[PDB]
Amino acid sequence: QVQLVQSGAEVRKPGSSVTISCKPVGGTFTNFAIHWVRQAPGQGLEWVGGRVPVVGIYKYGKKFHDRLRLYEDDPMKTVFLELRSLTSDDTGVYYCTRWRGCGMCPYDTSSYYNDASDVWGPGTKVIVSAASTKGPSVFPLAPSSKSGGTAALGCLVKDYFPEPVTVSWNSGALTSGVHTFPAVLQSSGLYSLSSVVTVPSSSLGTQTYICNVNHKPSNTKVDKKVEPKSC
Amino acid sequence: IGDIRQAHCNVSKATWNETLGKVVKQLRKHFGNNTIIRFANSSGGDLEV
């Protein structure tokens, strides 16, 4: 049984370069090839490159010439991925993949490259965004006539970073009906999301509704009230 | 540099089985027709022996 251990997440400015480590644990090093599979946020899997560690049997993707460079370091027994000229397309989670086989057979000195991947690294989140630790800017999503007994209201979190951001309603009081959408990466390089909830229209002007957005790295805690206007 | 494993020497089992089956008949000419002979590994002593 083998295992793959990667690096932690990183954030890089656009146009710069990033280097990701991957060290196998308890397996043959020079036999099977290490492939790299990435996943842009919300899209399918994309093959990056593959390389037998020391033998050098490698080949990169058509999309990654003059920007990718795979190398290794056998004193540390760790392979590395290097990607240059970073854009917001290159944001995603990068996986260290490998095949494992037999284990008991040691006399196999050959090198393999055309295989699947049953051994996967936990992943390394690479974020391409030219910005710094910025707190959110909560904006209300007030209900109005624009339905049939039940209306909807929410808060909009915009222009922030790291994204562990949590949203609660009335300090954990309102839980049912709450739908907090996943964060999206804007073209400007700042995260954004929105969390809404459905309430009966009879308790619009009666029950007070406030959000509780807590951005931990920036140490920001915002309690914004949702007040209807109805246009 | 790279993985490590012990040095070894490979001999095809079919050719060695045939070679032993051919030497045993030449050995029976001195030690008996329709008799059995054995051979185990070394006894012991010097590493070069």
Place this chain on the structure above:
Amino acid sequence: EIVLTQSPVTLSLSSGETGTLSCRASQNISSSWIAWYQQRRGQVPRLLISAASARAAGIPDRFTGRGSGTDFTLTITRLEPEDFGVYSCQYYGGSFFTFGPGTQVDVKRTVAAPSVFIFPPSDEQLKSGTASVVCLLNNFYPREAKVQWKVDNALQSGNSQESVTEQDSKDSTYSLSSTLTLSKADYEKHKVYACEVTHQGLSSPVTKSFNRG
């Protein structure tokens, strides 16, 4: 190049129900260079079947693989709520590996139309120079809802991103959040904003509109 395509984009299945995913290759490929992966909730992908038929280590009997030449199928006789998510097929033959686009599976449920809402921007955000109109589709089961923004009945494109939650555990419903983002001046060049929802269980495309004021 060698590129793969997956047909049953979203395949709904209940407990014990049987499904069959497909993975068509462009050229003719050998039946020893196709693998199937399981990806549940943005976690690590797990190799289901290698060589389009060889079931991997520990992969249960419910996953059977077939295919030859151009089309490759993955048949799931029965499934727990354990094996739900996105399935991908990989061609691992030549010097250039390529994956399938992915195919999500859903817990099969009765049809449900989305409750649509629309949220105008706040004046506090208008003091910052940006405008964000939100269109919401809540608690609808049949995936593949179509959201189209109309500005004075003129269709827009490009500046309208959207995000969808995962399939809810209790009621097996989905929710979509489309965010239309414009600038300060582009917000004032019109006054009628709306979003139209095209949906299966919705017998007519519902439009939720409002005016600038």
